[PDB]
Amino acid sequence: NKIFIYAGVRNHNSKTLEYTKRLSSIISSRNNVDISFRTPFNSELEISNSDSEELFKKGIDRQSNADDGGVIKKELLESDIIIISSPVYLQNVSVDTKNFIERIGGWSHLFRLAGKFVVTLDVAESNGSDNVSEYLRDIFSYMGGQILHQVSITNSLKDIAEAQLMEATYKIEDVLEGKIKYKTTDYQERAYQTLKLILENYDSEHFEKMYWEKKRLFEANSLEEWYYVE
Amino acid sequence: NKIFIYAGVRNHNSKTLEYTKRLSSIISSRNNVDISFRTPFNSELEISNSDSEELFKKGIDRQSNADDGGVIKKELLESDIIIISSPVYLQNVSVDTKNFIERIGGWSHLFRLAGKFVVTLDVAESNGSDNVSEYLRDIFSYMGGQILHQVSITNSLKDIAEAQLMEATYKIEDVLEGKIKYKTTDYQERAYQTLKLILENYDSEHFEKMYWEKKRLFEANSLEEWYYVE
Numbered sequence: 424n425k426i427f428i429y430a431g432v433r434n435h436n437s438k439t440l441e442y443t444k445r446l447s448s449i450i451s452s453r454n455n456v457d458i459s460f461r462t463p464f465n466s467e468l469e470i471s472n473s474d475s476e477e478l479f480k481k482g483i484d485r486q487s488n489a490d491d492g493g494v495i496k497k498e499l500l501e502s503d504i505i506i507i508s509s510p511v512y513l514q515n516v517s518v519d520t521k522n523f524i525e526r527i528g529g530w531s532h533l534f535r536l537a538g539k540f541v542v543t544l545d546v547a548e549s550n551g552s553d554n555v556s557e558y559l560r561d562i563f564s565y566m567g568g569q570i571l572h573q574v575s576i577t578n579s580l581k582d583i584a585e586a587q588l589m590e591a592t593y594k595i596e597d598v599l600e601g602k603i604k605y606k607t608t609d610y611q612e613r614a615y616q617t618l619k620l621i622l623e624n625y626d627s628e629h630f631e632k633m634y635w636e637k638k639r640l641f642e643a644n645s646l647e648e649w650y651y652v653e
Numbered sequence: 654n655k656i657f658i659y660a661g662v663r664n665h666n667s668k669t670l671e672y673t674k675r676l677s678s679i680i681s682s683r684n685n686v687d688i689s690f691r692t693p694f695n696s697e698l699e700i701s702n703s704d705s706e707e708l709f710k711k712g713i714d715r716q717s718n719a720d721d722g723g724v725i726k727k728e729l730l731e732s733d734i735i736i737i738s739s740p741v742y743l744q745n746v747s748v749d750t751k752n753f754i755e756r757i758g759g760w761s762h763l764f765r766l767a768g769k770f771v772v773t774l775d776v777a778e779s780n781g782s783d784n785v786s787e788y789l790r791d792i793f794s795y796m797g798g799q800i801l802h803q804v805s806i807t808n809s810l811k812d813i814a815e816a817q818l819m820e821a822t823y824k825i826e827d828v829l830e831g832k833i834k835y836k837t838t839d840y841q842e843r844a845y846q847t848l849k850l851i852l853e854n855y856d857s858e859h860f861e862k863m864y865w866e867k868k869r870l871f872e873a874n875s876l877e878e879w880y881y882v883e
């Protein structure tokens with residue numbers, strides 16, 4: 424299937440990039456897949472400068488058509504699996520990882536990643552791994568993606584890095600083999616019910632509300648039902 | 654006194670920028686201070702691309718002298734009070750706020766902000782405020798700065814915004830008046846004692862270790878003692 428990978432790092436000697444490349448190599452060496460590997464080195468994503476009003480109320484995004492933002496969104500929507508990797512810089516995601524996320528912020532309340540499987544990878548010296556994995560988990564999960572697996576590599580436990588990447592590969596293979604099917608979590612279902620109540624009182628011209636109506640997100644008992652019934 | 658301000662926002666219609674400009678005006682309208690207001694609109698900070706090895710082990714920074722990073726560091730070290738503001742984008746600091754922080758990542762374990770008073774401001778629509786304020790608090794505090802005050806403005810409670818900004822001003826004025834003196838927290842003392850033990854086994858050629866030696870960070874019983882003594 425199609426696998427989209429993005430590593431948010433600009434350091435030429437990045438260990439995050441190295442491990443991410445290693446992961447990609449393992450997957451393709453064991454499976455016949457179409458991988459799209461993107462980084463700040465081969466993809467240009469200008470820093471997000473959008474305004475809440477235009478972005479959410481009007482659904483306007485002028486940047487994506489000016490750089491690689493557009494093609495990235497297309498590949499994301501066309502992928503079966505998404506792999507996001509980030510270095511741990513000052514106990515937080517890297518600048519490029521944060522920008523990647525802000526560049527798709529418009530999907531924050533649209534569950535556009537519903538049906539996709541997300542794998543996260545973060546690399547640190549010895550701390551901050553948990554805060555980064557948790558932030559990535561929450562963001563992509565909120566967007567509707569299923570967190571298939573998360574990996575945190577640390578120099579402290581570098582000897583298990585290969586084994587950790589191999590374990591991620593096994594999870595991915597279960598998806599490629601059709602052994603794992605998209606399933607929403609309680610956290611996601613609650614987020615769904617919560618957002619619906621808010622968007623229900625929004626103006627009829629509000630882009631997000633119109634999107635929900637057009638996608639029939641309102642006429643559904645749950646997020647999982649919506650996905651499999653619509 | 655000298656006050657350094659940085660708003661990490663690239664959105665022309667930013668409410669964060671507007672609220673930060675308001676705080677700046679309030680302060681200068683009641684006090685004689687030297688304010689340096691920087692943002693991505695008047696300052697150039699390339700996205701951080703540093704490598705841990707070179708940055709911490711060798712103390713190499715190849716970007717600061719290439720753009721506005723150098724002058725920003727100088728103003729930070731010369732300032733008495735530091736004000737950092739950030740929009741709340743997907744429950745995290747903005748891309749530019751994250752970059753600002755990474756661009757001074759080299760000071761992570763040097764306590765170079767010891768003696769400075771930090772004020773943070775984050776602006777959100779309705780949520781994610783606490784995660785952003787808590788992150789800024791931890792980062793700047795860990796770097797030695799005293800968190801003088803924190804403000805979280807939300808559209809949900811926009812009616813108290815002015816009052817919130819006035820409260821920040823009073824805190825700042827007490828510093829300018831010389832009422833509040835720099836004092837470390839238990840969080841910082843523990844970080845200090847913890848770092849020392851680590852940098853004690855480091856190679857004699859390690860930049861961070863040599864820095865602590867030259868600054869006499871080793872010959873001290875506590876971080877606060879170190880500050881008022883050395």
Ligand SMILES: Cc1cc2nc3c(=O)[nH]c(=O)nc-3n(C[C@H](O)[C@H](O)[C@H](O)COP(=O)(O)O)c2cc1C
Pocket residue numbers: 432434436437438439440510511512513514515546547548549550551701703704705706708755756758759
């Ligand atoms: C500005 C900067 C901040 C960093 N902060 C942390 C951190 O908070 N925790 C940690 O364990 N390692 C930290 N590191 C070390 C990296 O996590 C480590 O080098 C890892 O390999 C990821 O970075 P890389 O992809 O650039 O190699 C930092 C590195 C830099 C350059």
Ligand SMILES: Cc1cc2nc3c(=O)[nH]c(=O)nc-3n(C[C@H](O)[C@H](O)[C@H](O)COP(=O)(O)O)c2cc1C
Pocket residue numbers: 471473474475478525526528529662664666667668669670740741742743744745776777778779780781
């Ligand atoms: C990409 C993007 C994601 C955002 N995420 C959040 C969020 O997580 N929580 C919230 O309450 N507001 C969120 N907002 C709304 C902003 O917090 C609000 O507009 C605030 O004024 C700060 O942004 P501004 O400085 O650009 O005005 C988001 C806005 C954008 C452009």
